[PDB]
Amino acid sequence: RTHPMAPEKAEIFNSLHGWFEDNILPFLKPVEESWQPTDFLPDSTSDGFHQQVEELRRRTAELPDDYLVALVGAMVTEEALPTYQTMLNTADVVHDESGASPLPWAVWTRAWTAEENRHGEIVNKYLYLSGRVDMKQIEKTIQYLIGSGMDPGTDNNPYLGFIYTSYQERATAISHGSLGRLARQKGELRLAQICGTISADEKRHEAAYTRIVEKLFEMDPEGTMLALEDMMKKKIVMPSHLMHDGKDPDLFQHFSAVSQRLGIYTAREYTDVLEHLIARWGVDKIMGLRDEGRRAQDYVCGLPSRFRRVEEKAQAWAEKVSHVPFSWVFGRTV
Amino acid sequence: VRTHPMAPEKAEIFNSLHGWFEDNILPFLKPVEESWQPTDFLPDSTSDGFHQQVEELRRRTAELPDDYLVALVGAMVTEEALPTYQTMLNTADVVHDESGASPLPWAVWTRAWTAEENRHGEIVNKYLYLSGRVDMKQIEKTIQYLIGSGMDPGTDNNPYLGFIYTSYQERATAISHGSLGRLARQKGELRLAQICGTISADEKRHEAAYTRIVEKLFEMDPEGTMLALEDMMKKKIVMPSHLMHDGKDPDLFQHFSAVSQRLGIYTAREYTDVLEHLIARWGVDKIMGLRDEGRRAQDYVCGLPSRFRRVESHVPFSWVFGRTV
Ligand SMILES: [Fe+2]
Ligand SMILES: [Fe+2]
Ligand SMILES: [Fe+2]
Ligand SMILES: [Fe+2]
Residues of A in contact with B46 (CB under 8 A): 131, 134, 330
Q: Do A82 and B131 touch (CB under 8 A)?
A: no
Rg of the Cα atoms in chain A: 21
Residues of A in contact with B157 (CB under 8 A): 97-98
Facing residue for A139 by CB, picked from B37, B140, B141 = B37
Range of the domain at A223: 1-334
* Domain count along chain A: 1
Q: How far, in Å, CA of A195 to CA of B223, rounded? A: 55
Q: How far, in Å, CA of A143 to CA of A158, rounded? A: 27
| H/E stretch holding A333 | strand A332-333
The Cα-based distances of B101 to A137, A263, B50, B105, B313 in angstroms read: 22, 30, 39, 11, 48
Q: How far, in Å, CA of B124 to CA of B113, rounded? A: 18
Report resolution (Å) to 1 decimal. Answer: 2.0
Residue A35 annotated as catalytic = yes
| H/E stretch holding A326 | strand A325-326
Q: How far, in Å, CA of A52 to CA of A125, rounded? A: 14
| Nearest ligand to residue A166 Cα | 2
User: How far does residue A27's CA lie from ligand 2's centre (Å)?
Assistant: 13
Give the DSSP per-residue string, B39-78: GGGS--TTSTTHHHHHHHHHHHHTT--HHHHHHHHHHHHH
Hey, is A99 helix, strand or coil?
A: coil
Neighbours of ion ligand 4 (CB under 5 A): B 203, 206
B16 has a chain A CB within 8 A of its CB? no
A83 has a chain B CB within 8 A of its CB? yes
Helix axes B105-131, B82-89, angle to 10 degrees: 170
Q: Do A146 and B111 touch (CB under 8 A)?
A: yes
Nearest to A177 by CA among A163, A161, A204, A198: A198
Facing residue for B99 by CB, picked from A54, A135, A151 = A151
| Nearest ligand to residue B167 Cα | 4
* Catalytic residue selected from B79, B122, B223, B249: B79
Q: How far, in Å, CA of B279 to CA of A242, rounded? A: 42
Q: How far, in Å, CA of A124 to CA of A147, rounded? A: 19
Q: Are B74 and B173 in contact (CB under 8 A)?
A: no
Give the DSSP per-residue string, B123-142: HHHHHHHHHT-S-HHHHHHH
Facing residue for B150 by CB, picked from A82, A100, A130 = A100
Q: How far, in Å, CA of A284 to CA of A303, rounded? A: 12
Interruptions in chain A after residues (C–N over 2.5 Å):
none
The Cα-based distances of B18 to B21, B107, B163, B181, B215 in angstroms read: 5, 11, 16, 37, 16
Q: Do A139 and B122 touch (CB under 8 A)?
A: yes
Rounded to the nearest angstrom, the minimum Cα separation between A84 and chain B is 8
Q: How far, in Å, CA of B53 to CA of B238, rounded? A: 38
